[PDB]
Amino acid sequence: TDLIKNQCVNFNFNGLTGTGVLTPSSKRFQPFQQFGRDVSDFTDSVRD
Amino acid sequence: VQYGECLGLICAQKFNGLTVLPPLLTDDMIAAYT
Ligand SMILES: *[C@@H]1O[C@H](CO)[C@@H](O[C@@H]2O[C@H](CO)[C@@H](O[C@@H]3O[C@H](CO)[C@@H](O)[C@H](O)[C@@H]3O)[C@H](O)[C@H]2NC(C)=O)[C@H](O)[C@H]1NC(C)=O
């Protein structure tokens, strides 16, 4: 499906589920990374 | 001289449900007293 950015939405990315507000970022992910985490054990960001 | 907070004005929150409330008296007000 498509998605709405900058809005509270329910997400179900392949292999990743939860709720929140999705916004564009600039995190320097490596070619072999799918998603990242915060200092706490919570997903911080995901690559589409 | 983590948690949700807000400065300025921009705010942010954390999935852990924790935050910190502001003081009534800001640093400037304290400086005024002293
Ligand atoms: C709550 O979110 C709104 C927007 O979603 C924030 O209001 C926006 O604040 C900026 C800065 O004061 C306003 O001015 C903008 O400045 C940028 C700087 O380059 C400029 O490019 C924009 O065209 C605009 O001038 C912006 O107009 C304003 N938006 C609205 C609708 O008022 C607000 O500050 C946020 N508040 C908190 C506590 O996060």
From Swiss-Prot, chain A:
Superkingdom as given in the UniProt entry: Viruses
Primary role: Attaches the virion to the cell membrane by interacting with host receptor, initiating the infection. Binding to human ACE2 and CLEC4M/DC-SIGNR receptors and internalization of the virus into the endosomes of the host cell induces conformational changes in the S glycoprotein. Proteolysis by cathepsin CTSL may unmask the fusion peptide of S2 and activate membrane fusion within endosomes.
Name of this protein: Spike protein S1
Encoding gene per record: S
